[PDB]
Structure 1
């Protein structure tokens, strides 16, 4: 709400040289990425992780951007890493996956909670179908993705979260089934052309 407005307002003031340097750094990070999934965010080891520093180049006031999902009225800020404090605040970027700047041979994974009384997070992610759209906002632009795969996995199976060569994917990840949470729901979209009006 206020946090997304803040991001977008500050984004609009950034000088082009500033955006260019930030994107240079983000692109270098992606091009050098050791593509190994850090872990399952809800495991005890991942919950307790310290401050994530790896995405500072993309951040305005600690937010890397926001993910907008019109069909379920979601627009959620994205923070670096997946520690407990991040999942309390919004969505977390899964360390080990591409930064959310798109490009050939990239796959960014964005995760959030489900079923909580106090913030809806990804509770309605279950409603998404193949063909649905979502929009990833970063300091440079807004990137459109169209869902091409929805699947359920066990928490430690990361095969579906790695880079697919020759493609540009973002997966939205939460827990499933409803109020059970033993597994993970993966909603994967592929990049499509988009010009924001």
Structure 2
């Protein structure tokens, strides 16, 4: 599955990756606000389309917790049951200045690890998004537990490239959301 996305990515043309990535970037620009309103909007359409079809965005590798979880567009349960749901209204995890991808995954499901261990992720820890365009790396710069009412941490920090691995916390209780935010680092 982390293969059936790797295989599905290789299997698709650079041009198509770019168009989708660029739809991702435009999606991100419109999230964040380089891209025209129309491409922004197309980016929104593509996200929405990715949303509609619960498209796999890729997968987030979190070395710390040995998680390599498929990311799907949308925080729909049907994604959250399968792996990481990219949070709607959130930058697609394609990196970029002023992208903030929020990748939500359950802090565990029955048998299913998912983000159950996100709490072990430690500032400085890295995690990576493999999206259709490749792997990008984040280093957690901020682990935050916030009430689930709090959105502010999930918005694009302009200038910044973040991906917050978002889960519910405390484990099991899920009162709060654990935001493990990675700041884009160079992928090595």
- Return the TM-score normalized by structure 2: 0.86
Q: Residues 82 and 53 from structure 1, CA distance in 2 versus in 1: closer, same or farther, beyond 3 angstroms?
A: farther
Q: 1:140 to 1:57 in 2, by over 3 A?
A: farther
Q: Normalising by structure 1, report the TM-score.
A: 0.82
Give ranges in structure 2 of 5+ residues lacking alignment. 34-44
Deviation sequence 1:86-128 (CA, Å, 0-9, x none): 2111110111111111111111100011243221111111111
Matching residue of 1:65: 58
Q: CA deviation at 1:57?
A: 6.2
Name whichever structure is richer in strand by fraction. Answer: 2
Aligned counterparts of 2:15 and 2:9: Cα–Cα separation in 1: 13
Tell me the C-alpha RMSD between the 2 structures: 2.3
**After superposition, what is the alpha-carbon deviation per residue over 1:43-97, rounded to whole angstroms, capped at 9, x for unaligned?**
xxxxxxxxx9725469x99211000011211000011111222211111011111
- Deviating more after overlay: 88-97 vs 7-16: 7-16
Which residue number corresponds to residue 134 of structure 2?
A: 141
User: For the residues of structure 2 that align with 1:74 and 1:33, how far apart are their CA atoms?
Assistant: 27
Aligned to 2:13: 15
Give the unaligned 5+ runs of structure 1. 36-51
Check the 8 A contact 1:22/1:57 in 2, yes or no. Answer: no
CA 1:173–1:57 in 2, change beyond 3 Å: closer, same or farther? closer
Does the 8 Å CA contact 1:67/1:134 hold for their aligned counterparts?
yes
Task: Report what 2:42 is aligned to.
Answer: none
